[PDB]
Design a protein around this motif. Structure first.
Motif, PDB file in Angstrom:
ATOM      1  N   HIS B  77       1.221  15.732   1.844  1.00 12.17           N
ATOM      2  CA  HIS B  77       2.118  14.690   2.313  1.00 12.17           C
ATOM      3  C   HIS B  77       3.161  14.431   1.250  1.00 12.17           C
ATOM      4  O   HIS B  77       3.212  15.122   0.236  1.00 12.17           O
ATOM      5  CB  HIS B  77       1.331  13.427   2.636  1.00 12.17           C
ATOM      6  CG  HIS B  77       0.351  13.631   3.740  1.00 12.17           C
ATOM      7  ND1 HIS B  77       0.745  13.820   5.046  1.00 12.17           N
ATOM      8  CD2 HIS B  77      -0.994  13.768   3.726  1.00 12.17           C
ATOM      9  CE1 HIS B  77      -0.317  14.068   5.791  1.00 12.17           C
ATOM     10  NE2 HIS B  77      -1.383  14.042   5.013  1.00 12.17           N
ATOM     11  N   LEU B  79       5.925  11.726  -1.094  1.00  7.84           N
ATOM     12  CA  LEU B  79       6.438  10.492  -1.650  1.00  7.84           C
ATOM     13  C   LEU B  79       7.938  10.848  -1.647  1.00  7.84           C
ATOM     14  O   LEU B  79       8.364  11.742  -2.374  1.00  7.84           O
ATOM     15  CB  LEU B  79       5.925  10.322  -3.078  1.00  7.84           C
ATOM     16  CG  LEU B  79       6.695   9.378  -3.985  1.00  7.84           C
ATOM     17  CD1 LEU B  79       6.449   7.905  -3.557  1.00  7.84           C
ATOM     18  CD2 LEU B  79       6.268   9.625  -5.416  1.00  7.84           C
ATOM     19  N   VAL B  80       8.739  10.194  -0.823  1.00  4.62           N
ATOM     20  CA  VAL B  80      10.151  10.549  -0.779  1.00  4.62           C
ATOM     21  C   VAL B  80      11.075   9.464  -1.280  1.00  4.62           C
ATOM     22  O   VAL B  80      10.772   8.265  -1.174  1.00  4.62           O
ATOM     23  CB  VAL B  80      10.616  10.864   0.649  1.00  4.62           C
ATOM     24  CG1 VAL B  80      11.873  11.720   0.613  1.00  4.62           C
ATOM     25  CG2 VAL B  80       9.517  11.547   1.409  1.00  4.62           C
ATOM     26  N   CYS B  81      12.203   9.890  -1.839  1.00  2.00           N
ATOM     27  CA  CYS B  81      13.203   8.930  -2.283  1.00  2.00           C
ATOM     28  C   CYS B  81      14.087   8.718  -1.060  1.00  2.00           C
ATOM     29  O   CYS B  81      14.676   9.658  -0.518  1.00  2.00           O
ATOM     30  CB  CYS B  81      14.058   9.459  -3.443  1.00  2.00           C
ATOM     31  SG  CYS B  81      15.460   8.331  -3.793  1.00  2.00           S
ATOM     32  N   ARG B  82      14.163   7.482  -0.607  1.00  2.00           N
ATOM     33  CA  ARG B  82      14.979   7.202   0.551  1.00  2.00           C
ATOM     34  C   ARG B  82      16.471   7.325   0.196  1.00  2.00           C
ATOM     35  O   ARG B  82      17.312   7.495   1.071  1.00  2.00           O
ATOM     36  CB  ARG B  82      14.631   5.804   1.076  1.00  2.00           C
ATOM     37  CG  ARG B  82      15.615   4.700   0.730  1.00  2.00           C
ATOM     38  CD  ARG B  82      14.919   3.463   0.190  1.00  2.00           C
ATOM     39  NE  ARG B  82      13.657   3.145   0.863  1.00  2.00           N
ATOM     40  CZ  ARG B  82      12.709   2.391   0.306  1.00  2.00           C
ATOM     41  NH1 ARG B  82      12.904   1.886  -0.908  1.00  2.00           N
ATOM     42  NH2 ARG B  82      11.556   2.176   0.932  1.00  2.00           N
ATOM     43  N   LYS B  86      14.764  13.180  -2.727  1.00  2.72           N
ATOM     44  CA  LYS B  86      13.872  13.875  -3.649  1.00  2.72           C
ATOM     45  C   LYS B  86      12.420  13.620  -3.188  1.00  2.72           C
ATOM     46  O   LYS B  86      12.102  12.550  -2.670  1.00  2.72           O
ATOM     47  CB  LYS B  86      14.086  13.329  -5.059  1.00  2.72           C
ATOM     48  CG  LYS B  86      13.352  14.056  -6.155  1.00  2.72           C
ATOM     49  CD  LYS B  86      13.567  13.347  -7.484  1.00  2.72           C
ATOM     50  CE  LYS B  86      15.044  13.229  -7.817  1.00  2.72           C
ATOM     51  NZ  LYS B  86      15.291  12.335  -8.995  1.00  2.72           N
ATOM     52  N   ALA B  87      11.533  14.582  -3.388  1.00  3.07           N
ATOM     53  CA  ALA B  87      10.175  14.398  -2.922  1.00  3.07           C
ATOM     54  C   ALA B  87       9.105  15.040  -3.769  1.00  3.07           C
ATOM     55  O   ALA B  87       9.349  16.027  -4.463  1.00  3.07           O
ATOM     56  CB  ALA B  87      10.053  14.903  -1.511  1.00  3.07           C
ATOM     57  N   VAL B  88       7.908  14.459  -3.681  1.00  2.64           N
ATOM     58  CA  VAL B  88       6.732  14.927  -4.400  1.00  2.64           C
ATOM     59  C   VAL B  88       5.654  15.297  -3.379  1.00  2.64           C
ATOM     60  O   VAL B  88       5.326  14.524  -2.469  1.00  2.64           O
ATOM     61  CB  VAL B  88       6.173  13.834  -5.324  1.00  2.64           C
ATOM     62  CG1 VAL B  88       4.882  14.308  -5.961  1.00  2.64           C
ATOM     63  CG2 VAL B  88       7.197  13.479  -6.399  1.00  2.64           C
ATOM     64  N   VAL B  90       2.152  15.518  -2.225  1.00  6.05           N
ATOM     65  CA  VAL B  90       0.952  14.791  -2.620  1.00  6.05           C
ATOM     66  C   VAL B  90      -0.222  14.993  -1.693  1.00  6.05           C
ATOM     67  O   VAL B  90      -0.067  15.201  -0.488  1.00  6.05           O
ATOM     68  CB  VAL B  90       1.247  13.270  -2.752  1.00  6.05           C
ATOM     69  CG1 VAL B  90       2.364  13.050  -3.792  1.00  6.05           C
ATOM     70  CG2 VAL B  90       1.650  12.685  -1.401  1.00  6.05           C
ATOM     71  N   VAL B 115       1.434  10.717   7.328  1.00  6.39           N
ATOM     72  CA  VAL B 115       1.365   9.885   6.142  1.00  6.39           C
ATOM     73  C   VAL B 115       2.526  10.231   5.220  1.00  6.39           C
ATOM     74  O   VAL B 115       2.652  11.374   4.800  1.00  6.39           O
ATOM     75  CB  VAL B 115       0.049  10.122   5.378  1.00  6.39           C
ATOM     76  CG1 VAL B 115       0.066   9.358   4.065  1.00  6.39           C
ATOM     77  CG2 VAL B 115      -1.143   9.694   6.236  1.00  6.39           C
ATOM     78  N   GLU B 116       3.386   9.255   4.931  1.00  8.66           N
ATOM     79  CA  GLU B 116       4.521   9.469   4.033  1.00  8.66           C
ATOM     80  C   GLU B 116       4.787   8.184   3.222  1.00  8.66           C
ATOM     81  O   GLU B 116       4.690   7.057   3.746  1.00  8.66           O
ATOM     82  CB  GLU B 116       5.790   9.845   4.820  1.00  8.66           C
ATOM     83  CG  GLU B 116       5.679  11.037   5.781  1.00  8.66           C
ATOM     84  CD  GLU B 116       5.458  12.398   5.098  1.00  8.66           C
ATOM     85  OE1 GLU B 116       5.623  12.500   3.867  1.00  8.66           O
ATOM     86  OE2 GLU B 116       5.129  13.379   5.806  1.00  8.66           O
ATOM     87  N   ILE B 117       5.099   8.361   1.939  1.00 12.08           N
ATOM     88  CA  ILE B 117       5.392   7.240   1.056  1.00 12.08           C
ATOM     89  C   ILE B 117       6.896   7.249   0.745  1.00 12.08           C
ATOM     90  O   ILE B 117       7.447   8.255   0.302  1.00 12.08           O
ATOM     91  CB  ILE B 117       4.599   7.325  -0.283  1.00 12.08           C
ATOM     92  CG1 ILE B 117       3.094   7.464  -0.033  1.00 12.08           C
ATOM     93  CG2 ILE B 117       4.802   6.055  -1.082  1.00 12.08           C
ATOM     94  CD1 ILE B 117       2.668   8.826   0.449  1.00 12.08           C
ATOM     95  N   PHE B 118       7.551   6.119   0.981  1.00  8.69           N
ATOM     96  CA  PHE B 118       8.981   5.982   0.740  1.00  8.69           C
ATOM     97  C   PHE B 118       9.238   5.068  -0.432  1.00  8.69           C
ATOM     98  O   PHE B 118       8.610   4.032  -0.564  1.00  8.69           O
ATOM     99  CB  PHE B 118       9.686   5.377   1.957  1.00  8.69           C
ATOM    100  CG  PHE B 118       9.746   6.285   3.142  1.00  8.69           C
ATOM    101  CD1 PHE B 118      10.663   7.328   3.190  1.00  8.69           C
ATOM    102  CD2 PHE B 118       8.884   6.101   4.209  1.00  8.69           C
ATOM    103  CE1 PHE B 118      10.724   8.186   4.293  1.00  8.69           C
ATOM    104  CE2 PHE B 118       8.938   6.956   5.315  1.00  8.69           C
ATOM    105  CZ  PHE B 118       9.862   8.001   5.354  1.00  8.69           C
ATOM    106  N   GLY B 119      10.172   5.450  -1.284  1.00  5.75           N
ATOM    107  CA  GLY B 119      10.516   4.603  -2.400  1.00  5.75           C
ATOM    108  C   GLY B 119      11.902   4.954  -2.884  1.00  5.75           C
ATOM    109  O   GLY B 119      12.660   5.674  -2.221  1.00  5.75           O
ATOM    110  N   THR B 120      12.231   4.461  -4.066  1.00  9.61           N
ATOM    111  CA  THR B 120      13.529   4.735  -4.656  1.00  9.61           C
ATOM    112  C   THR B 120      13.267   5.235  -6.055  1.00  9.61           C
ATOM    113  O   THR B 120      12.755   4.483  -6.892  1.00  9.61           O
ATOM    114  CB  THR B 120      14.374   3.466  -4.739  1.00  9.61           C
ATOM    115  OG1 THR B 120      14.444   2.856  -3.442  1.00  9.61           O
ATOM    116  CG2 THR B 120      15.776   3.797  -5.233  1.00  9.61           C
TER     117      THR B 120
END
Ligand SMILES: [Zn+2]
Ligand SMILES: [Zn+2]
Ligand SMILES: [Zn+2]
Ligand SMILES: [Zn+2]
Lengths: 127, 127
Positions: B77, B79-82, B86-88, B90, B115-120
């Motif tokens: 899955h 962790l993406v930068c909205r 950019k993404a990791v 995981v 399942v996805e994690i969004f952040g900056t």
């Protein structure tokens, strides 16, 4: 005005079904009650209710957004039937912690996550 | 024919960026290399590559689908930068088990989860 009246209409519409519904479906339910609301309006209201956390939103496999007014105010996720839209409010503490540690660890801020489980309930399984 | 040629073009395009990209962005990258591919075609190819598990897909906050060709074949899955995309990649074993037990427990079949994690990310955090 036409804003709060329609917002209540759309919200009351959601409270009539236990399943997730697309905006077009909701619009139709309203059209069946003799409501003069347009689809665009229905869509905007729902997107507004979503942001205010008054209804939960999720995407179907074909990219369609579907909505639902859920029982708890608690942060939760869902197991949805892709066939009928039936859903179970679910909480996963370990997922929550994992999602925080992953972001915290890669230096990401303003974290938000989306977690949804899709399946086919027994009822639909027999089609 | 024009199917495998374009599929490779679009796939090669994805391999040039480490970030998730919308179909319009990809189309533009191709248009910059002098490719005569249309947007519709680019979109269909990507949706086809997605189903074949050749590229990962995810929705942005504004409902836009964005794509990425990821390093592993392993189930994972992101962790993406909205902000930049950019993404990791995981993996969360506990999430996987939880997602199976939840479905198994409510009698749902053909389970699938998102399942996805969004952040900056830090870089974007300073805009
Ligand atoms: Zn909910
Ligand atoms: Zn069902
Ligand atoms: Zn991936
Ligand atoms: Zn970024």
């Amino acid at each position: 005005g036409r804003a709060t009246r329609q917002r209540a209409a759309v919200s009351a519409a959601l409270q009539e079904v236990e399943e997730f519904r697309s905006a077009q479906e909701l619009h139709d339910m309203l059209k069946h009650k003799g409501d003069a609301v347009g689809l665009t309006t229905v869509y905007r209201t729902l997107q507004s209710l979503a942001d205010a956390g008054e209804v939960d939103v999720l995407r179907t496999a074909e990219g369609e957004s579907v909505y639902r007014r859920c029982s708890t105010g608690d942060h939760h996720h869902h197991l949805v039937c892709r066939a009928c839209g039936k859903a179970v409010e679910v909480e996963g503490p370990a997922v929550e912690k994992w999602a925080e540690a992953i972001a915290a660890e890669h230096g990401y801020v303003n974290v938000a996550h989306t977690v949804e489980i899709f399946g086919t309930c027994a009822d639909c399984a027999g089609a």
